[PDB]
Amino acid sequence: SMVEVLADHPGELVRTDSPNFLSSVLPTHWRSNKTLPIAFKVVALGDVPDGTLVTVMAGNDENYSAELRNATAAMKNQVARFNDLRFVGRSGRGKSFTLTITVFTNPPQVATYHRAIKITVDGP
Ligand SMILES: [Br-]
Ligand SMILES: [Br-]
């Protein structure tokens, strides 16, 4: 249940735009190709079988899909932990990216991370 899921990771998970998924917290601004400070996790509140894949993509109005590294993970006990997701493509200092999350249930579900993320060559 959502209460149970929150109680397993208190103070760590945020809403996505889907009622069915939560996520861990990403930086608001990060350096291109730098390892993330908190490994990204997508958390299913609904029934999602172990092994169900989850893929993320980043983009905005001038870059439909910015390069990522290690942008797929598999669900285990309702959590898909990305071991080393990296944001390679840069948004620049003036724009940010939306991160879309696709969970490959049958059929797939799309969610969006709750904040934009800026990616630059130097980072913050
Ligand atoms: Br790119
Ligand atoms: Br840049």
Residues measured by CB to lie within 5 Å of ligand 2, the ion: 90, 92, 120-121
Experimental determination approach used: X-ray
Tell me which ligand sits closest to the C-alpha of residue 66.
Answer: 1
DSSP string, 85-111: -EE-S---SS--BEEEEEE-SSS-EEE
Domain residue limits at 99: 1-124
What is the DSSP code string of 68-82? EES-EEEEETTEEE-
Cα–Cα distance for residue pair 124/111, rounded to 1 Å: 26
DSSP of 13-73 = -EE-SSTTEEE-PPPSEEETTPPPSS--EEEESS---TT-EEEEEEEETTEEEE-EES-EE
- The C-alpha angle with vertex 17 and arms to 3 and 111, in degrees rounded to 5, equals 100
CA distance 7 to 17: 20
Resolution (A): 1.4
Alpha-carbon span 26 to 39, nearest angstrom: 8
Distance 94 CA to ligand 1 centre (A): 16
Give the number of domains in the chain.
1
Query: Can you say how many angstroms the Cα of residue 105 is from the centroid of all Cα atoms in its chain?
Result: 16
CATH number at residue 46: 2.60.40.720
* Distance in Å, CA 89 to ligand 2 centroid: 9
